[PDB]
Structures are given as structure tokens and as C-alpha cells.
Amino acid sequence: ATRFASVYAWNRKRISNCVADYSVLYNSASFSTFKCYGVSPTKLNDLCF
Amino acid sequence: LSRLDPPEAEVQIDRLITGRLQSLQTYVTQQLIRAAEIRASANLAATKM
């Protein structure tokens, strides 16, 4: 996307009713900080929620 | 194993192992005491017979 929200007015969105493919999350290592707590950063593609 | 990486999965598994081992030791001690009581009862029954 082009724009984001403020820290105080953080935008909340619901994700469901679709297939989640987080390949792009780690394929494009353009994010300075990428940390997962309680879930494997690499196994994100082998989980259901 | 799936949620957490080996670093902290090690301590989590260690805690689970400690708890389960404590439960097993308590159960085995109780079983030993009960077995001693039943052996005394069986000796009494054999003497009566």
C-alpha cells in the first residue's frame, strides 16, 4: 500500500476467509525488523488459524 | 516444537519433562506404598489359610 496509520490510531484489520501465503514476507528481506514470538518465523507457511 | 524455535523450545521441553517426571515419581512412590500394604494383607491371608 501507499500510506499507513499513526502509532496512536493504529489501523486494525481482520484477516480470514482466505489462504495465507507468507512467502513474500521473508522472500523480500527489505524489512529492518522481522520478529515472531510464539510462532516460527520460517514455519509460518505450515500453520493454520 | 512448531510454535517456538529450539532456543526456547529447549527450556519449555525441560519444564514439561521435569513436571512429568515429578508426577511419575509421585505415582511410583504411591504404588510402592500400596504394594507394600497389599503384600502385608496377602501375608496375613496366607497365614490365615
Alpha-carbon distance A27 to A45, whole Å?
Answer: 12
What is the distance between the alpha carbons of residues B35 and B13, in angstroms, rounded to a whole number?
A: 32
Asked whether the beta carbons of A47 and B2 are under 8 A apart, the reply is yes
Q: Which of B1, B18, B10, B19 is nearest to A38 (CA)?
A: B1
Please indicate if any CB of chain B lies within 8 Å of the CB of A47: yes
Contacts of A46 in chain B (CB under 8 A): 2
Amino acid letter, residue B44: L
Are B2 and A40 a contacting pair at CB < 8 A?
yes
Q: In chain B, what residues touch A43 (CB-CB under 8 Å)?
A: 2
Residue B4 sits at the chain A interface (C-beta within 8 Å): yes
Amino acid at A45: N
Structure method: cryo-EM
Cα A41 from Cα B6, distance rounded (Å): 12
Environment class of residue A5 by beta-carbon count within 10 Å: exposed (0-12), middle (13-18) or buried (19+)? exposed
Q: Determine the residue among B5, B8, B12 to mutate to test chain A binding: the one whose Cβ has the most chain A Cβ atoms within 10 Å.
A: B5
Phi first, then psi, for residue A3 (nearest 5°) are -135, 155
CB B12 within 8 A of CB B2: no
Q: Tell me how far apart the alpha carbons of residues B18 and B9 are, in angstroms, rounded to a whole number.
A: 14
Task: State the Cα–Cα distance between residues B33 and B35, nearest whole angstrom.
Answer: 5
